[PDB]
Design a protein around this ligand. Structure first.
Ligand SMILES: [Zn+2]
Ligand SMILES: [Zn+2]
Ligand SMILES: [Zn+2]
Ligand SMILES: [Zn+2]
Ligand SMILES: [Zn+2]
Ligand SMILES: [Zn+2]
Ligand SMILES: [Zn+2]
Length: 68
């Protein structure tokens, strides 16, 4: 908890990461398993950890699962 986690749902990774990095996030990305979530969700953020509203550390680990 040094910056509040945003809701990244629906973003492409080309937009998801720079948004996090701009918040000061210097931590490591854990890219999780893809999620088959239909065509509209293809390569968009489906899950995230920590959830939005959670205080995450500047170098804490963030996990993303993208639409298959
Ligand atoms: Zn863009
Ligand atoms: Zn990167
Ligand atoms: Zn992938
Ligand atoms: Zn499918
Ligand atoms: Zn489809
Ligand atoms: Zn797909
Ligand atoms: Zn993908």
């Amino acid at each position: 908890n040094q910056f509040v986690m945003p809701d990244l749902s629906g973003m492409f990774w080309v937009d998801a990461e720079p948004r996090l990095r701009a918040l000061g996030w210097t931590g490591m990305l854990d890219k999780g398993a893809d999620v088959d979530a239909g065509g509209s969700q293809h390569n968009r953020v489906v899950y995230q950890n920590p959830p939005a509203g959670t205080g995450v550390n500047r170098d804490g680990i963030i996990t993303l699962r993208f639409g298959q």
